[PDB]
């Protein structure tokens, strides 16, 4: 009900380490490929944790 939203901005993101160490049983992406995340630039990045 009170899920935490964190803004991610002004950083270079290496998603490869997310893959290297990962207890993440479910890794489901909707609008983008997981391996192309390292090849793209983004804004409006938000992490919602609950």
């Amino acid at each position: 009900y009170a899920w935490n939203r964190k803004r991610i901005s002004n950083c270079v993101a290496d998603y490869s380490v997310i893959y290297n160490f990962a207890p993440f049983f479910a890794f489901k992406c909707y609008g983008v490929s997981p391996t192309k995340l390292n090849d793209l630039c983004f804004t409006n990045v938000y992490a919602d944790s609950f």
């Binding site: 290297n20 993440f24 049983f25 890794f27 490929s33 997981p34 391996t35």
Partner: peptide, 19 residues
């Protein structure tokens, strides 16, 4: 691993898929 079973598929993104 248990969570790498999604990556043994055509077009999949991963570590073992690539190398």
């Amino acid at each position: 691993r248990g969570n790498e079973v999604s990556q043994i598929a055509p077009g999949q993104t991963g570590n073992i898929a690539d190398y």
